Design a protein around this ligand. Structure first.
Ligand SMILES: [Mg+2]
Ligand SMILES: [Mg+2]
Ligand SMILES: [Mg+2]
Ligand SMILES: [Mg+2]
Ligand SMILES: [Mg+2]
Ligand SMILES: [Mg+2]
Ligand SMILES: [Mg+2]
Ligand SMILES: [Mg+2]
Ligand SMILES: [Mg+2]
Ligand SMILES: [Mg+2]
Ligand SMILES: [Mg+2]
Ligand SMILES: [Mg+2]
Ligand SMILES: [Mg+2]
Ligand SMILES: [Mg+2]
Ligand SMILES: [Mg+2]
Ligand SMILES: [Mg+2]
Ligand SMILES: [Mg+2]
Ligand SMILES: [Mg+2]
Ligand SMILES: [Mg+2]
Ligand SMILES: [Mg+2]
Ligand SMILES: [Mg+2]
Ligand SMILES: [Mg+2]
Ligand SMILES: [Mg+2]
Ligand SMILES: [Mg+2]
Ligand SMILES: [Mg+2]
Ligand SMILES: [Mg+2]
Ligand SMILES: [Mg+2]
Ligand SMILES: [Mg+2]
Ligand SMILES: [Mg+2]
Ligand SMILES: [Mg+2]
Ligand SMILES: [Mg+2]
Ligand SMILES: [Mg+2]
Ligand SMILES: [Mg+2]
Ligand SMILES: [Mg+2]
Ligand SMILES: [Mg+2]
Ligand SMILES: [Mg+2]
Ligand SMILES: [Mg+2]
Ligand SMILES: [Mg+2]
Ligand SMILES: [Mg+2]
Ligand SMILES: [Mg+2]
Ligand SMILES: [Mg+2]
Ligand SMILES: [Mg+2]
Ligand SMILES: [Mg+2]
Ligand SMILES: [Mg+2]
Ligand SMILES: [Mg+2]
Ligand SMILES: [Mg+2]
Ligand SMILES: [Mg+2]
Ligand SMILES: [Zn+2]
Lengths: 97, 116, 181, 83, 23, 69
RNA sequence: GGCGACACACGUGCUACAAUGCCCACUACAAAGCGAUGCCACCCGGCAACGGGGAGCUAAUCGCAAAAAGGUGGGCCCAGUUCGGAUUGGGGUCUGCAACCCGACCCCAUGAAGCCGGAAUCGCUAGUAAUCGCGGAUCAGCCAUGCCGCGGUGAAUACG
RNA sequence: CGCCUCCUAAAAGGUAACGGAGGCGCCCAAAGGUCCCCUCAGGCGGGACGGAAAUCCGCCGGAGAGCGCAAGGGUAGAAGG
């Protein structure tokens, strides 16, 4: 299933559940989210949310950064959505000719 | 329910068929037919009634078998679970007993996966 | 009637030891056998392959006596039980056939039972009758591994003129009934 | 297990207290950090507090538990499941 | 197969000897 | 007894493994069994087939005594 | 004492689900290495792990050492089995001051899942892939199915 | 809104209200005629799978069961099987 790693930090089951609820935005596209993996970590300037996810049509790899950790998580999602919507529709572009 | 309480398969050889008894493996298949002088290749369907009762008798009076072997194995596991030793606790939980790791695998003692 | 060993054992050995141990003043007071009732409560032949006749051919081999159908008193939803369904076999054994069946029961059948420990000593009526139940039917000498498909047991009621458990305990044991305790 | 050719191991320092109690008409609660020591019939009936790394666990010794080690009776991991 | 101690092939795998693999 | 519905009881010999022979009545004239009451271990006294063990445990072990006193 | 925990989840592997296979007995053909409280010939005891004797070798000499697949012959007969070897009971060996947590190995018995694997995904272009065994470092021992090497047998396919 | 049962209904019969409660508009080729046989529910104890209750055995048990369906009456010295 979905795995969450908190590198050199400690987090609560509540925060892990928030991440799972935010990753659920990707379920919109109705494609298989295969072993999604979120890495959470703290730089000196703020938090870093990493993610690697494979789908039937490719991989999603994105990194979000921000002072506020929930915002870094959201920036991660925004980058992941635009990658997934690309994987799902790019092949449609050259139907003609 | 011939010997020794298990209707051992015919059509197969005697050394094989004896293994279909709780307490008789390959090692005791070689043993029982050596004492009673029977060709281990002969099929159970071709045992002479003398060979049967000869093979039946030695088999039952020498080793603890089916029912009584099951009772002792249980009674040994029971008392381990009663003196409260470490091997006893692992039997009181279904967890493994011979030092194996449980972070992964251990599905024989645990059973198929219990989803959360 | 016939000359059978268990019957001869009742009259020559058992009756005197009973009179001895209890002091009966009348020959009719000493306990005796009334009947043995065997009952296969099959029930797995409800609306299922109600060709339980396979079992009827088995009890008839065991007893020498064609058993009789028992039918459902009422209907039972949870058992899938409609009133009047055939759900058992009861055969009543008296006189010579009773003696012949018990002779093989004690000598042959009971020793064949898996991991046999002896009959349940507390299974007495409270009023001088005994009841034992069996799991398989290969326990009896007339049933061989070939002819039998499924495993079916029975209930066995041993009825007795003794008025008390103690007297019926004495009669049965002296006949050869093995008791664990 | 331990070679039959060698002996039945008891730390000998724990064993001293066992026999000194048997003589005096035992007993008193024995504190030990000897999980490695075999139970021996001279110990039957006593109660010995066995260190599991954190606490000394008072364990009463009976007839049936003689071939074992003292550690088998003071488990070291507290665990009550998940959930 | 190789995981079966009670056979020669299993003893070759482990790297040991015994009744089922003599020296 | 009704007719044509009952298997006829005939004189019968049952044969156990221990040479025991039983002259009784049955619907098979000759029968073979693996065990009878003349040789079954619950019947024939405390015939403990294999394990007339005792226990044997626990102090039973006795290997050995050389630990000092 | 813990790092070896265990409702779960992923990565890497080992062994398999059998007949081009499994088992037994007999019989060949390597390379690279390691080895003076070390490697151990050969003898004896034990079914065995191993133990007691005891020769040789500062080692192109003596030893680990048998290579395995293969070859010969025999068993098995399509079955959860003579497939598979997990799990557990009982009994032993050895290292070690000490194998409870928490060692490897032997023996008896137990004989699980597994009938070729969804979405998805890895490797490999020639002595390669596949398959078979051997050695070494670490090391009292060993959880090595790992790693670094060594040879045996030996393919398929590439339009583009 | 017709029909059935009980109550109201004042111990014959009958007796009203937009009084209190329920049912019918079918069914059965046996669930009918006759002859013969049989006796319940329930409680306790005993009995493989088998349970509160399947089927078996024993003891007690006048009718509390049953009688296709409401209710009432009737009923085993049968109308019940
Ligand atoms: Mg996680
Ligand atoms: Mg955390
Ligand atoms: Mg990065
Ligand atoms: Mg958006
Ligand atoms: Mg067996
Ligand atoms: Mg381990
Ligand atoms: Mg562990
Ligand atoms: Mg008389
Ligand atoms: Mg009683
Ligand atoms: Mg009576
Ligand atoms: Mg039989
Ligand atoms: Mg195998
Ligand atoms: Mg007539
Ligand atoms: Mg430690
Ligand atoms: Mg670690
Ligand atoms: Mg989880
Ligand atoms: Mg998985
Ligand atoms: Mg591995
Ligand atoms: Mg894997
Ligand atoms: Mg592999
Ligand atoms: Mg080395
Ligand atoms: Mg199996
Ligand atoms: Mg299966
Ligand atoms: Mg097998
Ligand atoms: Mg064990
Ligand atoms: Mg250890
Ligand atoms: Mg197959
Ligand atoms: Mg394969
Ligand atoms: Mg695919
Ligand atoms: Mg290339
Ligand atoms: Mg292979
Ligand atoms: Mg190697
Ligand atoms: Mg090493
Ligand atoms: Mg009118
Ligand atoms: Mg009126
Ligand atoms: Mg009135
Ligand atoms: Mg009136
Ligand atoms: Mg009038
Ligand atoms: Mg009105
Ligand atoms: Mg109406
Ligand atoms: Mg009629
Ligand atoms: Mg009753
Ligand atoms: Mg009852
Ligand atoms: Mg029951
Ligand atoms: Mg009942
Ligand atoms: Mg009534
Ligand atoms: Mg109605
Ligand atoms: Zn006999």
């Amino acid at each position: 299933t979905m795995n969450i790693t908190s590198k050199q930090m400690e987090i609560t089951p509540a925060i892990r559940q928030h991440v799972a609820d935010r990753l659920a935005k990707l379920e919109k596209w109705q494609t298989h989210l295969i072993n999604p993996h979120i890495i959470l970590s703290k730089e000196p300037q703020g938090f870093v949310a990493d993610a690697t996810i494979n789908t039937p049509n490719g991989v999603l790899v994105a990194s979000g950064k921000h002072e506020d950790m929930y915002t870094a998580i959201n920036e991660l999602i925004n980058k992941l959505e635009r990658q997934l919507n690309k994987l799902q529709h790019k092949g449609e572009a050259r139907r003609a000719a | 329910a011939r010997i020794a309480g298990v209707e051992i398969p015919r059509n197969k050889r005697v050394d094989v068929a004896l293994t279909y008894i709780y307490g008789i493996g390959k090692a005791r298949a070689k043993e029982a037919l050596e004492k009673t002088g029977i060709n281990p290749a002969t099929r159970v369907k071709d045992l002479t009634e003398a060979e049967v009762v000869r093979l039946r008798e030695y088999v039952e009076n020498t080793w603890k078998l089916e029912g009584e072997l099951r009772a002792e194995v249980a009674a040994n596991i029971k008392r381990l679970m009663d003196i409260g030793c470490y091997r006893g606790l692992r039997h009181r939980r279904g967890l493994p007993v011979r030092g194996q790791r449980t972070r992964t695998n251990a599905r024989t003692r645990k059973g198929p996966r219990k989803t959360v | 009637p016939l000359d059978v060993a268990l019957k001869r054992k009742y009259y020559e050995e058992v009756r005197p030891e009973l009179i001895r141990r209890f002091g009966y003043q009348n020959v009719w007071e000493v306990p005796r056998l009334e009947k043995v009732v065997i009952n296969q409560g099959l029930g797995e032949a409800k609306e299922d392959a109600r060709i339980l006749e396979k079992a009827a051919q088995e009890l008839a081999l065991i007893t020498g006596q064609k058993p009789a159908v028992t039918r459902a008193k009422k209907s039972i939803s949870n058992f899938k039980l409609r009133k009047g369904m055939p759900i058992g076999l009861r055969v009543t054994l008296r006189r010579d056939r009773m003696w012949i069946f018990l002779e093989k029961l004690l000598n042959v059948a009971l020793p064949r039972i898996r991991d046999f420990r002896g009959l349940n000593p507390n299974s007495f009526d409270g009023r001088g009758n005994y009841n034992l139940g069996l799991r398989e039917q290969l326990i009896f000498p007339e049933i061989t591994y070939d002819m039998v498909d499924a495993l079916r047991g029975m209930d066995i009621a041993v009825v007795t003129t003794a008025e008390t458990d103690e007297e019926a305990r004495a009669l049965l044991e002296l006949l050869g009934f093995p008791f664990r305790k | 297990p331990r070679s039959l050719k060698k002996g039945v191991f008891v730390d000998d320092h724990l064993l001293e207290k066992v026999l000194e109690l048997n003589a005096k008409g035992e007993k008193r609660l024995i504190k030990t950090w000897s999980r490695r020591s075999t139970i021996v019939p001279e110990m039957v009936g006593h109660t010995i507090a066995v260190y599991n790394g954190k606490q000394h666990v008072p364990v009463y010794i009976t007839e049936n538990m003689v071939g074992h080690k003292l550690g088998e009776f003071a488990p070291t991991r507290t665990y009550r499941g998940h959930g | 197969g190789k995981g079966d101690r009670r056979t020669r092939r299993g003893k070759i795998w482990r790297g040991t000897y015994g009744k089922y693999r003599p020296r | 007894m009704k007719e044509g519905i009952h298997p006829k009881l005939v004189p019968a010999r049952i044969i156990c493994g221990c040479g025991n022979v039983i002259e009784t009545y049955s619907t098979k004239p000759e029968i073979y069994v693996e065990v009878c009451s003349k040789c079954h271990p619950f019947y024939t006294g405390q015939q403990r087939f294999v394990d007339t063990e005792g226990r044997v445990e626990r102090f039973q072990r006795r290997y050995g005594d050389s630990y000092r006193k």
